[PDB]
Write an enzyme that holds these catalytic residues in place. Sequence first.
Site, short mmCIF file in Angstrom:
data_model
loop_
_atom_site.label_atom_id
_atom_site.label_comp_id
_atom_site.label_asym_id
_atom_site.label_seq_id
_atom_site.Cartn_x
_atom_site.Cartn_y
_atom_site.Cartn_z
N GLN A 175 31.40 73.72 59.91
CA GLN A 175 30.81 72.41 60.17
C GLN A 175 31.90 71.37 60.31
OE1 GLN A 175 26.75 71.88 57.99
NE2 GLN A 175 27.97 73.21 56.65
N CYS A 177 27.35 77.92 46.64
CA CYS A 177 27.67 78.83 47.73
C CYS A 177 28.04 80.16 47.10
CB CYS A 177 28.85 78.30 48.57
SG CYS A 177 29.41 79.33 49.93
N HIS A 213 30.97 68.85 49.30
CA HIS A 213 32.02 69.85 49.07
C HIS A 213 33.24 69.21 48.43
CE1 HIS A 213 30.18 72.56 52.25
NE2 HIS A 213 29.76 71.38 52.67
N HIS A 220 36.25 76.28 48.47
CA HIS A 220 35.45 75.08 48.29
C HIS A 220 34.49 75.25 47.13
CE1 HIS A 220 31.39 75.89 50.46
NE2 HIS A 220 31.94 77.06 50.17
N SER A 256 25.18 70.96 54.63
CA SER A 256 24.92 71.88 53.52
C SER A 256 24.84 71.15 52.19
CB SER A 256 26.00 72.96 53.42
OG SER A 256 26.22 73.62 54.66
#
Length: 145
Positions: free
Chosen positions: A113, A95, A139, A41, A136
């Site tokens: 998630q 990330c 993505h 991702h 977060s």
Amino acid sequence: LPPGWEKRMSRSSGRVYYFNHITNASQWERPSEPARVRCSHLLVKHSQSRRPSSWRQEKITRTKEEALELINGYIQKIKSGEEDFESLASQFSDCSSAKARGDLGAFSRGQMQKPFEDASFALRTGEMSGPVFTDSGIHIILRTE
Ligand SMILES: *S(=O)(=O)c1cc(C(=O)O)cc(C(=O)NC[C@@H]2CCCC2=O)c1
């Protein structure tokens, strides 16, 4: 139609396309479960992320709207063929998986998630999601196995 696909009308051309409301992917061609999948991702965080901080930037100040514009630009570049997913994940993902070209490894349901999980299991091998929203951030997901 497979799971999550709907037939839609292109506003600019009037040609039909297909949209997946689980992965948020769109494609022109008509689209044709496993215990685990493997995904990479690219994450873009924003000021409303659960943690507005990343390995790459101590204080993330961009708005959610700015993060979506960034994501949409990365999607355009990857779909165009001009840049590989891996290249943009390494350079821009908020990330630390960026340093593994975005790879998160294999996982099953119950670990990630939920919107990320659902998109990951609805993608075909090799397929890329559209913008997927979690706490977060935003993505782009590539299913690799
Ligand atoms: S649709 O025309 O409303 C539409 C919605 C979205 C979205 O909200 O994600 C995206 C697209 C889109 O990608 N348009 C360009 C081409 C349509 C077929 C696949 C494309 O790359 C349209």
